[PDB]
Design a protein around this ligand. Structure first.
Ligand SMILES: OCc1ccccc1
Ligand SMILES: OCc1ccccc1
Ligand SMILES: [Cu+2]
Length: 188
């Protein structure tokens, strides 16, 4: 077949009920995630082929970067709660990995202030139980898919994208196959 279990994707032994339709895991500390998001634009390319009414969920992970990694998961929870993911994703990636000016929770907060989020609003979100719940949600989701590394993407809580089984000989062919595979899995 054109799409084959074990090639472009794998199948979880224990599928996850109630999982988001398309669930991506990343870290702002992860060099491959920087490439994935800032160079290859995989999430955008996946969105360009997704059907009507299929939402992309992106969760941050704790296990890269120690204390700062956890601060970044909490700040990603703030971004989701305030709906500002598309204002902070690029400056957070660049602040951690390009300029390396993000070394503390305050440096993360500066990115939000510079992007126009009011200081009192960031702080209220940062300290909120809504955000603590979103942190726990991201952690539980990683547990449910038995997450072993990032970047990773899962469809319908059943299928895991397998970029190592795709055509890596050309970056455009690769990105297209990845997005095409997500669409195939969403309809599967
Ligand atoms: O991060 C954007 C960028 C990278 C390299 C050169 C110019 C701009
Ligand atoms: O500042 C830590 C970091 C730098 C470059 C790539 C990943 C993480
Ligand atoms: Cu091909």
């Amino acid at each position: 077949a054109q799409y084959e279990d074990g090639k472009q994707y794998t199948t979880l032994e224990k599928p996850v009920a109630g999982a988001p339709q398309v669930l991506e895991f990343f870290s702002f500390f992860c060099p491959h995630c920087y490439q994935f998001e800032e160079v290859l634009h995989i999430s955008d390319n996946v969105k360009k082929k997704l059907p009507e009414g299929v939402k992309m969920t992106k969760y941050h992970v704790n296990f890269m970067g120690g204390d700062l990694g956890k601060d970044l998961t909490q700040a990603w929870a703030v971004a989701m709660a305030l709906g500002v993911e598309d204002k902070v994703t690029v400056p957070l990636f660049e602040g951690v990995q390009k300029t390396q000016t993000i070394r503390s929770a305050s440096d993360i907060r500066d990115v939000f202030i510079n992007a126009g989020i009011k200081g009192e609003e960031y702080d209220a979100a940062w300290n909120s139980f809504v955000v603590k719940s979103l942190v726990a949600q991201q952690e539980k989701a990683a547990a449910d898919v038995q997450l072993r590394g990032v970047p990773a993407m899962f469809v319908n809580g059943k299928y895991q994208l397998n970029p190592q089984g795709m055509d890596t000989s050309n970056m455009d062919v690769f990105v297209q196959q990845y997005a095409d595979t997500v669409k195939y899995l969403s309809e599967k």
